[PDB]
């Protein structure tokens, strides 16, 4: 029993230093983990902290692994830190709110996670952008709703559309003005491939979540109401600042929409005030504690609800011994959710527990079995039971107010609509008739098919979908242009602007960016292979959108989620475990 071992440095502490452990090169990862816990003795919560390990650029997600297989000695530094750091996260509204993000995931997975908090549908067309109101809470799970289950007092604009600006400032901002000044913004994009660590980015930095393919799945105006107005919101500002040009009259119809949207964001009523229940109810959890647990999707469930008290089984025969839970329903907070003509009954309890509130959202079928499991939990938080007059005095009322169901239910604003060389040739006056004319047509839309039309109008322009990748090419001086554009890629003679090169991506065989030489080649069926080397905008992003959009437009044929992240880590070159 003899060990002769090393000595170890772990930081800890918002700063960057802590303390010194012992362990050998024999030692499990895991176990320096709880040998690092005990040399401090704080009272926190690690269950997200993990180490940093930055001599050699990575951490170790093997919790078990020898400290001598990572080749850790005592030599180089380490540091004990929480995996999850808040950032500020600018929208592509304009707008920003701070959140944690991962900075162990690999990028891709980060943004993932991101536009999972923020109720973005289909994560593999936005990314994360260098640097040039509300916190953060914890979900983890497939996906769940009540209108985005955000339950708290902050619940900020970004599915709603933003006011459109003063015309004053919408001159003063930056505007495009040539190429080589719009392939800046391409210039900031993350390697959406290595972790936030491995790009520089500290603890309260700030990032830019864009739109970054422009080949956008299942825009669905029911499905993705985030999504669909952080997209429009971004299509926009890149038509009032000149980063896509459009004509004098869909300028008209740009701006006519942007009223129509703008005109509708500005506008039941539950208006109320105050023996066994067995049914087959669909029932939702929520974990206290879900740092370590996932939730299944609405589960049906046997719910038993007697004389105060609620279980729920999964079959009557394994009742009434052996509940999923039990709880004090003496507590309080129970607020529905109706909605007759999408028959969602859906009722929220926050059930005060020592360990913390378990929330529960259960949902019935028809408006009496709704009828009769709010009446009865709705009393049962006011400590009497079903067995009172007024919960046949309360059912009475809920299936009276439920009785209706589905058969009937200007200002003259500025010319700031417009981009700012159509306010500069225009006087605000004669181009308001216009947009107010070719608002008529879109007067019958809602704000989501309106909001869908103004990113159709969009994907019609001649030049949408290009990103403007300024780089030098294969036997040619003066550095022409690149430019990605999802189903091809051209080259444009930067000074006289015309399309030299148009090859299409379904032509290009398999050939990816590498060397020392710092160049890109592509193969291009019929042995016509093009090469081209980064001029000072970079290399990788180069090639993670042409990876990146090969694979968008190949995926899943109605329903395209669950891709394959091997895949895109593969379509960005390189394999990890």
Known sequence: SSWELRVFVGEEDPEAESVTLRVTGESHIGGVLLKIVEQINRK????????WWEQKRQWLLQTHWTLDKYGILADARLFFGPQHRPVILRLPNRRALRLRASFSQPLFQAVAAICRLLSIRHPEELSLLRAPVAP?????????????????????????????????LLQRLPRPSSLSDKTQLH??????????????????????????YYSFFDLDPKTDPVRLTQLYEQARWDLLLEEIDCTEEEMMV???????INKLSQSXXXXXXXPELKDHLRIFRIPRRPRKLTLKGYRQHWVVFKETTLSYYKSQDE????????????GCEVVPDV???GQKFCIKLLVPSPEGMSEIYLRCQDEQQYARWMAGCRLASKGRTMADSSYTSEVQAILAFLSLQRTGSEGLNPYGLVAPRFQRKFKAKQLTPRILEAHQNVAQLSLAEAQLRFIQA?????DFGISYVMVRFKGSRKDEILGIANNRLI???????????????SNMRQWNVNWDIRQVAIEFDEHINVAFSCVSASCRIVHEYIGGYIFLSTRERARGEELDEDLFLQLTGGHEA
């Open 458 to 462: 969009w994907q019609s322009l001649p």
């Open 44 to 51: 926190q919560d690690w269950s997200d902290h993990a180490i």
């Open 187 to 212: 210039s900031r994009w993350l390697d959406s491939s290595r972790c936030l660590m491995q790009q520089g980015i500290k603890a309260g930095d700030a990032l830019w979540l864009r739109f970054k």
């Open 254 to 260: 740009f701006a006519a929409l942007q009223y129509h």
């Open 136 to 168: 953060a809470l914890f979900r983890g799970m497939p996906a769940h709703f009540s209108d985005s289950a955000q339950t708290e007092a902050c619940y900020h604009m970004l599915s709603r559309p933003q006011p459109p600006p003063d015309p004053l």
């Open 491 to 505: 080259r444009i003679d930067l000074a006289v602007g015309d399309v030299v090169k148009t090859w299409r991506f």
């Open 339 to 341: 909605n007759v003509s």
């Open 319 to 330: 009742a009434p011994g052996d509940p999923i839970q039990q709880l004090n329903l003496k």
